[PDB]
């Protein structure tokens, strides 16, 4: 409805890997990562097409090659692994972090299931993959969304 | 019929912008297939829903 409580935070601690279906004009998804951020959970909103292989990006270090633009050699910037570098800067008095992936609807189902099975093998870490659209913002776990 | 990555299909449905364009398919996935259309100057692959693609020999 309109008056939303904190059921979105409890569903994320239950499932670990949610899948929001937000209105496509925006503005109503981010009211649920404020209830998430009020409960100690920090948020790293990334972009789902910008990630490469999620194994080599999130839990492994990746060599990002910047734009040399014809006036530079092929530099290889080894960035730290994203979910395990933002966990160590996250202090242990607060809760985990959430991956607020936007435009999740261009991710394959093999990358959906990899984000689903990672949230329990890695402690204090969850994902919310914004996939698809609906007239009313609603969520479901990623375990049965790949089973659709 | 099933689609392998590299056969020449052509679109058959009329409620589509690409009515009868043909080309090589590329990167078939769990429900979707992208068909490289080989159109003129800039080659363009467009996603489809693994149907309405009748190949030719």
């Amino acid at each position: 409805g309109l008056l939303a409580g904190y059921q979105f935070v409890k569903d994320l601690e239950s499932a670990g890997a949610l899948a929001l279906f937000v209105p496509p004009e925006g503005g109503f998804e981010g009211r649920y990562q404020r209830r998430l951020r009020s409960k100690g959970y920090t948020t790293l909103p990334m972009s789902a097409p910008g990630l490469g292989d999620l194994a080599a990006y999130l839990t492994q270090e990746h060599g990002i090659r910047p734009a040399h633009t014809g006036k530079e050699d092929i530099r290889v910037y080894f960035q730290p692994p994203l979910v395990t570098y933002h966990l160590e800067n996250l202090p242990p008095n607060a809760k985990g972090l959430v991956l607020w992936l936007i435009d999740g609807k261009r991710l394959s189902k093999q990358e959906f299931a990899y984000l689903a099975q990672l949230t329990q093998t890695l402690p204090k870490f969850k994902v919310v993959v914004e996939v698809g659209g609906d007239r009313v913002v609603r969520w479901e776990p990623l375990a049965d969304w790949v089973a659709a | 019929m099933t689609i392998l990555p590299g056969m020449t299909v052509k679109v058959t449905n009329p409620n589509d912008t690409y009515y009868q364009f043909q080309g090589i398919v590329q990167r078939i996935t769990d429900g979707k297939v992208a068909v490289l259309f080989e159109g003129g100057n800039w080659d363009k692959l467009v996603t489809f829903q693994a149907s309405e693609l009748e190949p030719v020999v």
């Binding site: 910037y77 080894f78 800067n89 | -």
Partner: protein
């Protein structure tokens, strides 16, 4: 006239500031590093850029007082703050609303 050199991290004005209102002077140059809090500073490195700000003002005190010459000082300060990131002295602020990483991404050293 208010000759100024306003990059993202360096705001060098030609004048002194009395409570927000900048008054154009001829003798002085005012500098506030990081108007937006993109880098989390400390007491050590804020004096390290004062070893660079008063160095470049004293070095370029034989040239003209133009917007081109203030931009040459404000650029070499902005090349000095970026060297403090690559030395790991200061780090990016996470309480800021933007996380666009203007002075390069975090990356590990030698793979």
């Amino acid at each position: 006239m208010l000759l100024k050199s306003t990059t993202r991290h360096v705001h060098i004005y030609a004048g002194h500031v009395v409570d927000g209102e900048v008054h154009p002077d001829t003798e002085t140059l005012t500098l506030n590093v990081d108007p937006d809090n993109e880098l989390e500073w400390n007491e050590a490195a804020l004096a390290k850029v004062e070893a660079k700000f008063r160095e470049l003002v004293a070095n370029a005190a034989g040239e003209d007082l133009t917007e081109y010459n203030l931009r040459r000082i404000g650029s070499d300060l902005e090349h000095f703050i970026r060297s403090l990131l690559m030395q790991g002295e200061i780090g990016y602020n996470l309480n800021s609303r933007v996380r666009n990483y203007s002075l390069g991404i975090p990356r590990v050293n030698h793979s």
